[PDB]
Coordinates of C-alpha atoms in Angstrom, one line a residue:
Chain A
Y1 CA 103.9 -15.8 -7.3
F2 CA 105.5 -16.7 -4.0
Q3 CA 108.2 -14.7 -2.4
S4 CA 110.6 -16.6 0.0
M5 CA 112.2 -14.8 2.9
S6 CA 115.1 -15.6 5.1
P7 CA 114.8 -14.9 8.8
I8 CA 116.0 -11.6 10.5
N9 CA 118.9 -12.7 12.6
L10 CA 118.1 -11.4 16.2
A11 CA 120.2 -10.9 19.3
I12 CA 118.8 -10.3 22.9
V13 CA 120.5 -8.1 25.3
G14 CA 119.3 -8.2 28.9
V15 CA 117.5 -10.6 31.3
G16 CA 114.6 -10.6 33.7
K17 CA 110.9 -11.7 33.9
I18 CA 109.7 -9.9 30.7
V19 CA 112.7 -11.6 28.8
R20 CA 111.4 -15.2 30.0
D21 CA 107.7 -14.6 30.0
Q22 CA 107.3 -12.4 26.8
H23 CA 110.3 -11.9 24.6
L24 CA 111.8 -15.5 24.2
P25 CA 108.3 -17.1 23.9
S26 CA 107.2 -14.6 21.2
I27 CA 110.6 -15.0 19.4
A28 CA 110.3 -18.8 19.5
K29 CA 106.9 -18.6 17.6
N30 CA 108.0 -15.9 15.1
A31 CA 109.4 -17.4 11.9
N32 CA 110.7 -14.0 10.5
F33 CA 113.4 -14.0 13.3
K34 CA 116.2 -16.4 14.1
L35 CA 117.7 -15.9 17.6
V36 CA 121.3 -16.2 17.0
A37 CA 122.9 -14.6 20.2
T38 CA 122.4 -13.2 23.7
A39 CA 124.6 -10.7 25.6
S40 CA 124.3 -10.3 29.4
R41 CA 126.4 -10.7 32.5
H42 CA 123.2 -12.1 34.2
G43 CA 122.4 -15.2 32.1
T44 CA 122.4 -17.2 28.9
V45 CA 120.0 -19.1 26.8
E46 CA 120.5 -22.9 26.3
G47 CA 121.9 -23.7 22.8
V48 CA 122.2 -20.1 21.8
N49 CA 125.7 -18.5 21.5
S50 CA 126.2 -16.3 24.6
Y51 CA 128.4 -13.2 25.3
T52 CA 128.9 -11.0 28.4
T53 CA 129.0 -7.7 26.5
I54 CA 127.0 -6.3 23.5
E55 CA 130.4 -5.2 22.0
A56 CA 131.8 -8.8 22.3
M57 CA 128.7 -10.1 20.6
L58 CA 128.6 -7.5 17.7
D59 CA 132.3 -8.3 17.0
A60 CA 131.8 -12.2 17.0
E61 CA 128.4 -12.4 15.3
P62 CA 128.5 -10.4 12.0
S63 CA 125.4 -12.1 10.7
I64 CA 123.2 -10.2 13.3
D65 CA 120.6 -7.9 11.7
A66 CA 118.7 -6.7 14.8
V67 CA 118.8 -6.5 18.6
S68 CA 116.0 -6.5 21.3
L69 CA 117.2 -4.4 24.3
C70 CA 115.4 -5.6 27.4
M71 CA 117.2 -3.8 30.2
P72 CA 115.7 -1.0 32.2
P73 CA 116.0 2.6 30.5
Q74 CA 118.9 3.5 33.0
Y75 CA 121.5 1.3 31.4
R76 CA 120.0 1.2 28.0
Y77 CA 121.2 4.3 25.9
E78 CA 124.9 3.0 25.6
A79 CA 123.8 -0.4 24.4
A80 CA 121.3 1.1 21.9
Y81 CA 123.9 3.4 20.7
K82 CA 126.5 0.7 19.9
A83 CA 123.9 -1.4 18.1
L84 CA 122.8 1.4 15.9
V85 CA 126.5 2.4 15.3
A86 CA 126.9 -1.2 14.1
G87 CA 123.9 -0.7 11.8
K88 CA 121.5 -3.1 13.6
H89 CA 117.7 -2.6 13.9
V90 CA 116.7 -2.0 17.5
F91 CA 113.8 -3.0 19.6
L92 CA 113.5 -0.9 22.7
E93 CA 111.6 -2.0 25.8
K94 CA 109.1 0.5 27.3
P95 CA 109.7 3.4 28.1
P96 CA 112.1 3.9 25.2
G97 CA 114.7 5.8 27.4
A98 CA 115.2 7.6 30.7
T99 CA 115.0 11.0 29.1
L100 CA 113.3 12.3 25.9
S101 CA 116.6 13.8 24.9
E102 CA 118.4 10.4 24.8
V103 CA 115.6 9.0 22.7
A104 CA 115.7 11.9 20.2
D105 CA 119.4 11.3 19.9
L106 CA 119.0 7.5 19.3
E107 CA 116.3 8.3 16.7
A108 CA 118.7 10.7 14.8
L109 CA 121.5 8.1 14.9
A110 CA 119.1 5.4 13.5
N111 CA 117.9 7.5 10.5
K112 CA 121.6 8.3 9.8
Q113 CA 122.4 4.7 9.7
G114 CA 119.3 3.5 7.8
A115 CA 118.6 1.3 10.8
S116 CA 115.0 0.7 12.1
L117 CA 114.5 1.8 15.7
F118 CA 111.3 0.7 17.6
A119 CA 109.8 2.1 20.9
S120 CA 107.7 -0.7 21.9
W121 CA 104.5 0.0 23.9
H122 CA 103.0 -3.4 24.7
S123 CA 99.7 -2.1 26.0
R124 CA 99.0 -0.4 22.7
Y125 CA 98.8 -4.0 21.3
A126 CA 96.3 -5.3 23.9
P127 CA 93.5 -7.1 21.9
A128 CA 90.6 -4.6 21.9
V129 CA 92.8 -1.6 21.2
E130 CA 92.1 -1.2 17.4
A131 CA 88.4 -1.8 17.7
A132 CA 88.3 1.1 20.2
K133 CA 90.4 3.3 17.8
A134 CA 88.1 2.5 14.8
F135 CA 85.0 3.1 17.0
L136 CA 86.0 6.5 18.3
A137 CA 86.8 7.5 14.7
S138 CA 83.1 6.9 13.7
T139 CA 81.4 8.7 16.6
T140 CA 81.5 12.1 18.3
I141 CA 83.3 12.3 21.7
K142 CA 82.2 14.1 24.8
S143 CA 84.7 13.4 27.6
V144 CA 87.3 10.7 28.4
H145 CA 88.1 9.4 31.9
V146 CA 91.2 7.2 32.5
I147 CA 91.3 4.9 35.5
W148 CA 94.4 3.0 36.3
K149 CA 94.5 2.1 39.9
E150 CA 96.4 -0.9 41.2
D151 CA 98.1 -2.0 44.4
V152 CA 101.8 -1.6 44.6
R153 CA 102.3 -4.3 47.2
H154 CA 100.8 -6.9 44.9
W155 CA 102.8 -6.0 41.8
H156 CA 106.0 -4.3 43.0
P157 CA 106.8 -6.1 46.2
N158 CA 109.8 -4.5 48.2
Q159 CA 111.2 -3.0 45.0
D160 CA 113.6 0.1 45.3
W161 CA 113.9 1.3 41.7
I162 CA 110.4 2.6 41.2
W163 CA 111.0 5.3 43.9
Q164 CA 114.4 6.6 42.7
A165 CA 114.4 10.0 41.1
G166 CA 113.9 9.0 37.5
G167 CA 112.0 5.7 38.2
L168 CA 108.7 7.4 37.4
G169 CA 106.7 6.2 40.4
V170 CA 103.0 5.5 39.4
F171 CA 103.9 6.7 35.9
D172 CA 105.6 3.4 35.4
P173 CA 102.3 1.5 35.0
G174 CA 100.7 4.8 34.0
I175 CA 102.5 5.3 30.7
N176 CA 100.7 2.2 29.5
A177 CA 97.4 3.9 29.7
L178 CA 98.9 7.0 28.1
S179 CA 100.3 4.7 25.3
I180 CA 96.7 3.5 24.7
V181 CA 95.0 7.0 24.9
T182 CA 97.5 8.4 22.6
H183 CA 96.7 5.8 20.0
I184 CA 92.9 5.7 20.6
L185 CA 91.9 9.4 20.6
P186 CA 91.3 11.1 17.2
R187 CA 93.4 14.2 17.9
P188 CA 96.6 14.6 20.1
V189 CA 96.0 15.9 23.6
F190 CA 98.0 18.0 26.0
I191 CA 98.3 18.4 29.7
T192 CA 96.4 21.3 31.1
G193 CA 96.8 20.6 34.8
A194 CA 98.3 18.0 37.1
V195 CA 98.7 17.1 40.7
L196 CA 101.6 14.8 41.7
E197 CA 101.4 12.9 45.1
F198 CA 104.7 12.1 46.6
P199 CA 105.5 10.2 49.8
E200 CA 107.9 11.6 52.3
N201 CA 110.5 9.4 50.8
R202 CA 110.8 8.4 48.1
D203 CA 111.6 10.7 45.2
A204 CA 108.9 9.5 42.9
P205 CA 105.0 9.7 43.1
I206 CA 102.4 7.4 44.3
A207 CA 99.3 9.0 42.6
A208 CA 98.5 11.5 40.0
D209 CA 95.5 13.5 38.9
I210 CA 95.9 14.9 35.3
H211 CA 93.7 16.8 33.0
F212 CA 94.3 17.1 29.2
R213 CA 92.6 18.9 26.4
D214 CA 92.8 18.6 22.6
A215 CA 92.5 21.6 20.1
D216 CA 88.6 21.2 20.1
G217 CA 88.7 21.3 24.0
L218 CA 87.7 17.7 24.5
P219 CA 88.4 17.0 28.2
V220 CA 90.4 14.0 29.4
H221 CA 90.7 13.1 33.1
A222 CA 93.3 10.6 34.2
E223 CA 93.7 9.2 37.8
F224 CA 96.6 7.0 38.5
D225 CA 96.7 5.3 41.9
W226 CA 99.0 2.8 43.6
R227 CA 97.0 2.3 46.7
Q228 CA 93.9 0.7 45.1
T229 CA 94.2 -2.5 47.4
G230 CA 90.6 -3.5 46.5
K231 CA 89.1 -3.6 43.0
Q232 CA 91.8 -3.5 40.3
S233 CA 91.1 -1.0 37.6
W234 CA 92.7 -0.5 34.2
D235 CA 90.0 1.3 32.3
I236 CA 89.6 4.1 29.8
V237 CA 85.9 5.2 29.6
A238 CA 84.8 7.5 26.8
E239 CA 81.3 9.2 26.9
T240 CA 80.2 9.3 23.3
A241 CA 77.1 10.0 21.3
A242 CA 76.8 6.5 20.2
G243 CA 77.0 6.1 23.2
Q244 CA 79.6 5.2 25.8
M245 CA 82.7 3.0 25.2
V246 CA 84.5 1.2 28.0
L247 CA 88.0 -0.3 27.3
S248 CA 89.0 -2.3 30.3
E249 CA 91.6 -4.8 31.5
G250 CA 94.5 -2.8 30.0
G251 CA 93.1 -2.6 26.6
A252 CA 91.9 -6.2 26.6
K253 CA 88.0 -6.0 26.5
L254 CA 85.5 -3.6 24.8
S255 CA 81.9 -2.8 25.9
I256 CA 80.0 -0.4 23.6
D257 CA 76.9 0.9 25.7
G258 CA 77.0 -2.6 27.3
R259 CA 77.2 -4.9 24.3
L260 CA 80.7 -6.2 25.3
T261 CA 82.1 -7.3 22.0
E262 CA 90.2 -12.1 21.4
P263 CA 93.1 -13.3 23.6
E264 CA 96.0 -11.3 24.9
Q265 CA 98.8 -11.2 22.1
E266 CA 100.8 -8.0 23.0
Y267 CA 104.4 -9.2 22.6
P268 CA 103.7 -11.4 19.5
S269 CA 102.2 -8.3 17.8
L270 CA 105.2 -6.2 18.9
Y271 CA 107.4 -8.7 17.1
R272 CA 105.1 -8.6 14.1
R273 CA 105.4 -4.8 14.1
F274 CA 109.2 -5.0 14.4
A275 CA 109.5 -7.5 11.4
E276 CA 107.1 -5.2 9.5
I277 CA 109.0 -2.0 9.9
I278 CA 112.4 -3.6 9.1
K279 CA 111.0 -4.9 5.8
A280 CA 109.5 -1.5 5.1
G281 CA 112.9 0.1 6.0
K282 CA 111.4 2.6 8.5
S283 CA 111.5 3.5 12.2
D284 CA 108.5 3.5 14.7
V285 CA 109.4 5.8 17.6
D286 CA 106.3 7.3 19.0
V287 CA 107.4 9.3 22.1
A288 CA 104.0 10.8 22.8
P289 CA 103.3 8.8 26.0
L290 CA 106.7 9.5 27.5
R291 CA 106.3 13.1 26.4
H292 CA 103.0 13.2 28.5
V293 CA 104.8 11.8 31.5
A294 CA 107.5 14.5 31.3
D295 CA 105.0 17.2 30.8
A296 CA 103.1 16.0 33.9
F297 CA 106.3 16.2 36.0
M298 CA 107.1 19.6 34.6
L299 CA 103.5 21.1 35.1
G300 CA 102.6 19.1 38.2
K301 CA 101.7 20.6 41.6
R302 CA 104.0 18.5 43.9
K303 CA 101.7 17.3 46.8
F304 CA 102.9 15.4 49.9
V305 CA 100.8 12.6 51.3
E306 CA 102.7 10.5 53.9
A307 CA 105.5 7.8 54.1
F308 CA 105.7 4.4 52.5
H309 CA 107.3 1.2 53.7
Chain B
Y1 CA 119.8 42.0 -11.3
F2 CA 117.9 43.5 -8.3
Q3 CA 114.9 41.7 -6.7
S4 CA 112.3 43.9 -5.2
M5 CA 110.3 42.7 -2.2
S6 CA 107.2 43.8 -0.5
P7 CA 107.0 43.7 3.4
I8 CA 105.6 40.8 5.3
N9 CA 102.4 42.2 6.9
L10 CA 102.8 41.5 10.7
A11 CA 100.3 41.5 13.6
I12 CA 101.2 41.5 17.4
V13 CA 99.3 39.8 19.9
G14 CA 100.0 40.6 23.6
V15 CA 101.6 43.3 25.7
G16 CA 104.2 43.8 28.4
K17 CA 107.7 44.8 28.9
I18 CA 109.3 42.6 26.1
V19 CA 106.6 44.0 23.7
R20 CA 107.7 47.6 24.4
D21 CA 111.5 47.1 25.0
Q22 CA 112.2 44.4 22.3
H23 CA 109.4 43.6 19.8
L24 CA 108.1 47.0 18.7
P25 CA 111.5 48.5 18.5
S26 CA 113.0 45.6 16.4
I27 CA 110.0 45.7 14.1
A28 CA 110.2 49.4 13.6
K29 CA 113.8 49.0 12.3
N30 CA 113.0 45.9 10.1
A31 CA 112.0 46.7 6.5
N32 CA 110.9 43.2 5.7
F33 CA 107.9 43.7 8.0
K34 CA 105.0 46.1 8.1
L35 CA 103.2 46.3 11.4
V36 CA 99.6 46.3 10.3
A37 CA 97.6 45.3 13.5
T38 CA 97.6 44.5 17.3
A39 CA 95.2 42.4 19.3
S40 CA 95.0 42.6 23.0
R41 CA 92.5 43.5 25.7
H42 CA 95.5 45.3 27.5
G43 CA 96.6 47.9 25.1
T44 CA 97.0 49.3 21.6
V45 CA 99.8 50.9 19.5
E46 CA 99.3 54.6 18.4
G47 CA 98.4 54.8 14.7
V48 CA 98.2 51.0 14.2
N49 CA 94.7 49.3 13.8
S50 CA 93.8 47.6 17.1
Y51 CA 91.5 44.7 18.0
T52 CA 90.6 43.1 21.4
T53 CA 90.8 39.5 20.1
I54 CA 92.9 37.6 17.7
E55 CA 89.8 36.3 15.9
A56 CA 88.4 39.8 15.4
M57 CA 91.8 40.8 13.9
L58 CA 92.1 37.8 11.6
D59 CA 88.6 38.5 10.3
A60 CA 89.1 42.2 9.7
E61 CA 92.7 42.2 8.4
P62 CA 93.0 39.7 5.5
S63 CA 96.2 41.2 4.3
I64 CA 98.1 39.8 7.5
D65 CA 100.9 37.3 6.6
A66 CA 102.4 36.7 10.1
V67 CA 101.8 37.1 13.8
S68 CA 104.2 37.5 16.8
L69 CA 102.6 36.1 19.9
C70 CA 104.1 37.7 23.0
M71 CA 101.9 36.5 25.8
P72 CA 103.1 33.9 28.4
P73 CA 103.0 30.2 27.4
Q74 CA 99.8 29.7 29.5
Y75 CA 97.4 31.6 27.3
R76 CA 99.3 31.0 24.2
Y77 CA 98.3 27.7 22.5
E78 CA 94.8 28.9 21.5
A79 CA 96.1 32.0 19.9
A80 CA 98.8 30.2 18.1
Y81 CA 96.4 27.6 16.9
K82 CA 93.8 30.1 15.3
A83 CA 96.7 31.9 13.6
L84 CA 98.0 28.8 12.0
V85 CA 94.4 27.7 11.1
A86 CA 94.2 31.1 9.4
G87 CA 97.5 30.2 7.6
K88 CA 99.7 32.9 9.1
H89 CA 103.3 32.4 10.1
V90 CA 103.8 32.5 13.8
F91 CA 106.6 33.9 15.9
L92 CA 106.4 32.3 19.4
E93 CA 108.0 34.0 22.5
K94 CA 110.2 31.8 24.8
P95 CA 109.6 29.1 25.9
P96 CA 107.4 28.0 22.9
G97 CA 104.5 26.4 24.9
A98 CA 103.6 25.2 28.5
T99 CA 104.1 21.6 27.5
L100 CA 106.1 19.8 24.9
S101 CA 102.9 18.2 23.6
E102 CA 101.2 21.5 22.8
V103 CA 104.2 22.5 20.8
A104 CA 104.5 19.3 18.9
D105 CA 100.8 19.7 18.0
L106 CA 101.3 23.4 16.8
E107 CA 104.3 22.2 14.8
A108 CA 102.1 19.5 13.0
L109 CA 99.4 22.1 12.4
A110 CA 102.0 24.5 10.8
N111 CA 103.5 21.9 8.4
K112 CA 99.9 20.9 7.3
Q113 CA 99.1 24.6 6.5
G114 CA 102.5 25.4 4.9
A115 CA 102.9 28.1 7.6
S116 CA 106.3 28.9 9.1
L117 CA 106.3 28.4 12.9
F118 CA 109.2 29.9 14.9
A119 CA 110.3 29.1 18.6
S120 CA 112.3 32.1 19.4
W121 CA 115.2 31.7 21.8
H122 CA 116.6 35.2 22.3
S123 CA 119.8 34.2 24.1
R124 CA 120.8 32.0 21.2
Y125 CA 121.2 35.3 19.3
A126 CA 123.5 37.1 21.9
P127 CA 126.4 38.5 20.1
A128 CA 129.3 36.1 20.9
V129 CA 127.2 33.0 20.4
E130 CA 128.3 32.0 16.8
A131 CA 131.9 32.6 17.5
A132 CA 131.7 30.2 20.4
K133 CA 129.9 27.7 18.2
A134 CA 132.6 27.9 15.4
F135 CA 135.4 27.7 18.0
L136 CA 134.2 24.6 19.7
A137 CA 133.9 23.0 16.3
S138 CA 137.7 23.4 15.7
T139 CA 139.0 22.1 19.0
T140 CA 138.6 19.0 21.2
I141 CA 136.5 19.5 24.3
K142 CA 137.1 18.2 27.8
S143 CA 134.3 19.4 30.1
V144 CA 131.6 22.1 30.2
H145 CA 130.4 24.0 33.2
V146 CA 127.3 26.3 33.1
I147 CA 126.9 29.1 35.7
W148 CA 123.7 30.9 35.7
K149 CA 123.1 32.5 39.1
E150 CA 121.2 35.6 39.7
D151 CA 119.1 37.3 42.4
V152 CA 115.4 36.8 42.2
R153 CA 114.6 39.9 44.2
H154 CA 116.4 42.2 41.7
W155 CA 114.8 40.6 38.5
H156 CA 111.4 39.2 39.6
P157 CA 110.2 41.5 42.4
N158 CA 107.0 40.2 44.2
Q159 CA 105.9 38.2 41.1
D160 CA 103.6 35.2 41.7
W161 CA 103.7 33.4 38.3
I162 CA 107.2 32.1 38.5
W163 CA 106.2 29.9 41.5
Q164 CA 103.0 28.4 40.0
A165 CA 103.2 24.7 39.2
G166 CA 104.1 25.2 35.5
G167 CA 106.0 28.5 36.0
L168 CA 109.3 26.7 35.7
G169 CA 110.9 28.4 38.8
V170 CA 114.8 29.0 38.1
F171 CA 114.4 27.2 34.8
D172 CA 112.7 30.3 33.4
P173 CA 116.0 32.2 33.3
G174 CA 117.8 28.7 33.0
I175 CA 116.3 27.7 29.7
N176 CA 118.3 30.6 28.2
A177 CA 121.6 28.9 29.1
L178 CA 120.1 25.7 27.8
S179 CA 119.2 27.4 24.5
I180 CA 122.9 28.4 24.1
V181 CA 124.5 25.2 25.1
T182 CA 122.2 23.3 22.9
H183 CA 123.4 25.5 20.0
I184 CA 127.1 25.7 21.0
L185 CA 128.0 22.0 21.7
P186 CA 128.9 19.8 18.8
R187 CA 126.9 16.9 19.8
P188 CA 123.4 16.7 21.6
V189 CA 123.6 16.1 25.3
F190 CA 121.1 14.5 27.8
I191 CA 120.5 14.7 31.5
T192 CA 122.2 12.0 33.5
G193 CA 121.3 13.3 36.9
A194 CA 119.5 16.2 38.5
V195 CA 118.7 17.8 41.9
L196 CA 115.8 20.2 42.1
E197 CA 115.6 22.6 45.1
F198 CA 112.1 23.7 46.0
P199 CA 111.0 26.1 48.8
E200 CA 108.2 25.0 51.2
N201 CA 105.8 26.9 48.9
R202 CA 105.9 27.5 46.1
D203 CA 105.4 24.6 43.6
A204 CA 108.5 25.6 41.5
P205 CA 112.3 25.3 42.1
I206 CA 114.8 28.0 43.3
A207 CA 118.0 26.1 42.3
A208 CA 119.0 23.1 40.3
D209 CA 122.2 21.1 39.9
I210 CA 122.2 19.2 36.6
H211 CA 124.6 16.8 34.9
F212 CA 124.5 15.8 31.2
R213 CA 126.5 13.6 28.9
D214 CA 126.8 13.3 25.1
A215 CA 127.4 10.0 23.3
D216 CA 131.3 10.3 23.7
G217 CA 130.6 10.9 27.5
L218 CA 131.6 14.6 27.5
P219 CA 130.6 15.8 30.9
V220 CA 128.4 19.0 31.4
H221 CA 127.7 20.5 34.7
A222 CA 125.0 23.1 35.2
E223 CA 124.1 25.1 38.3
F224 CA 121.1 27.4 38.3
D225 CA 120.7 29.6 41.3
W226 CA 118.2 32.3 42.3
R227 CA 119.9 33.4 45.5
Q228 CA 123.1 34.8 44.1
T229 CA 122.6 38.2 45.7
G230 CA 126.3 39.1 45.0
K231 CA 128.2 38.7 41.8
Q232 CA 125.9 38.2 38.8
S233 CA 126.8 35.2 36.8
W234 CA 125.6 34.1 33.3
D235 CA 128.6 32.0 32.0
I236 CA 129.3 28.9 30.2
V237 CA 132.9 27.7 30.6
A238 CA 134.4 25.1 28.4
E239 CA 137.7 23.4 29.1
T240 CA 139.3 22.7 25.8
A241 CA 142.6 21.7 24.4
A242 CA 143.0 25.1 22.7
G243 CA 142.6 25.8 25.6
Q244 CA 139.6 27.2 27.6
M245 CA 136.7 29.3 26.3
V246 CA 134.6 31.4 28.5
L247 CA 131.2 32.7 27.2
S248 CA 129.8 35.3 29.6
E249 CA 127.1 37.8 30.1
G250 CA 124.4 35.6 28.6
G251 CA 126.3 34.9 25.4
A252 CA 127.5 38.5 25.0
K253 CA 131.3 38.2 25.5
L254 CA 133.9 35.6 24.4
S255 CA 137.4 35.1 26.1
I256 CA 139.6 32.3 24.5
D257 CA 142.3 31.5 27.0
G258 CA 142.1 35.2 28.1
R259 CA 142.3 36.9 24.8
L260 CA 138.8 38.4 25.2
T261 CA 137.8 38.8 21.5
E262 CA 129.9 43.3 19.1
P263 CA 126.8 44.9 20.8
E264 CA 123.6 43.1 21.9
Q265 CA 121.2 42.6 18.9
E266 CA 119.1 39.6 20.1
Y267 CA 115.6 40.6 19.1
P268 CA 116.7 42.2 15.8
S269 CA 118.3 39.0 14.8
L270 CA 115.2 37.0 15.9
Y271 CA 113.2 39.1 13.3
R272 CA 115.9 38.6 10.7
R273 CA 115.6 34.8 11.4
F274 CA 111.8 35.0 11.1
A275 CA 111.9 37.0 7.8
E276 CA 114.5 34.4 6.6
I277 CA 112.5 31.2 7.3
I278 CA 109.2 32.7 5.9
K279 CA 111.0 33.5 2.6
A280 CA 112.6 30.0 2.6
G281 CA 109.1 28.4 3.4
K282 CA 110.3 26.5 6.4
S283 CA 109.8 26.3 10.1
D284 CA 112.4 26.7 12.9
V285 CA 111.0 24.9 16.1
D286 CA 114.0 23.7 18.1
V287 CA 112.5 22.3 21.3
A288 CA 115.7 20.9 22.7
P289 CA 116.0 23.5 25.5
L290 CA 112.5 22.9 26.7
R291 CA 113.0 19.2 26.3
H292 CA 116.0 19.5 28.8
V293 CA 113.8 21.4 31.2
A294 CA 111.2 18.7 31.1
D295 CA 113.7 15.9 31.5
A296 CA 115.2 17.7 34.5
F297 CA 111.8 17.8 36.2
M298 CA 111.2 14.1 35.3
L299 CA 114.6 12.9 36.6
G300 CA 115.2 15.3 39.4
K301 CA 115.5 14.4 43.0
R302 CA 113.1 16.9 44.6
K303 CA 115.0 18.5 47.5
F304 CA 113.4 20.9 50.1
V305 CA 115.4 23.9 51.3
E306 CA 113.1 26.5 53.2
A307 CA 110.5 29.1 52.6
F308 CA 110.5 32.2 50.4
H309 CA 108.8 35.5 51.0

């Protein structure tokens, strides 16, 4: 027989491009959620109750069940903490925190409160991702090459944050490839060597060359480059004995040998995942891609290339 | 009534100073262990069966129950992996791996095999550590200052490894203070800002200034310095309202207010801990201090100071 379900009452904290282009539109389509409030000193949503602080909102809106926290990782611990302390489920934007320690702390808090915490990784939900995963599982794998090369100027015009110590530099778009690889490969990998290319100012890298291995010694090469002004590349190529998969366009398209076998629904699947784990009563906090970033910074030979303006 | 127990049959893999000064002597005193074999291309132990490779030893000595792996983190994954694959308990030297990812991998392997894995942190077992921990628990804490300043020249004469990318630089002795703080404090902390001081060659830092917070905003300041040629400092000072604790000499001595309240038994307690968790059927892999190191490298403003010879 049919089981009726009331919506999960959702609040949004934060504003910006991703909030307008991705969050709000996906929420509007998702019937398992009701958007009941927003909290921000930088904007409101027409016809939705608004508050300037997360504490003000948690006080005044006791019907809230969950919160999507859309700010950058810098400001984000404190807000995630109060939400979980209130017992709300929490949807974290990518990467899930500034440090791994903050995140492991938030995770412990969440378990203790029975609240579902979620590290979203949008790229992991790009439309050819699961078909790559299922493929690689039936097949034997030889090598893996990750190419993620894009032009800063085009995507991050005049921005300061990316270059702060902590801003991650090229790892900012790079963690997305990591969030795919981590899901796609059969076995976990680890960094074996890394080179990090910094400008003379600022305190964050422009390119990286990284090698990984798994336990069976499968080699993984990753190149991240923020100077690729020409052809845009977001691919992960795997030499297989069945016999060569290419996943391109940030996980969007899959060509087995050359037989190129759906449309981009990343944020809508994130919200499906969030609805899903709330109803299962679980968390989904995979830190593996942020862990790879931190390892790269810890192991990386710090190489200086020029200046950037 | 009395319960009799046979020894845990132990193998040692690796050689060096710590093997002679700490491991072997502690093993010799510990009746819960029997040293049955060694594996190394760099030395043997008189009257103990010797092998050149860990695989040779695991084949020929089926009575082995556990292994202490004493090599540096570089070589150490592969050996830890084969041991756990064999189903042996594993005692890892500090830090437990080169990367956090390798360690999380070894941990998963261990659980899957039912084998006890152990990240040893010797300094955590320094003789005033538990008295600090119990103190801070009954008390309210204001601030925490960590001073860990030592002269390289004295302790690491002419060594190359410490400066490799991956060698950790000053974080090598610094992770020991981290391994205390992590145990001593009531709540977990996280890095809020960090400065990392590199020489012009090599690829690893000489000093670090690091700030942390916990959830209640308790401030923690840490200074690590490898140029302190004068007074040797390994202290962690906590301003309390009961009313000021000093833990000095790498966790060895405790002065509450000035009432300075045992002798150094780090490795013997490590082996007690290892015997203990094997009999309980559990692992003890606290990565929190290595996690702090990786965070520091990921968040750190990379500052250049001079050259080093």
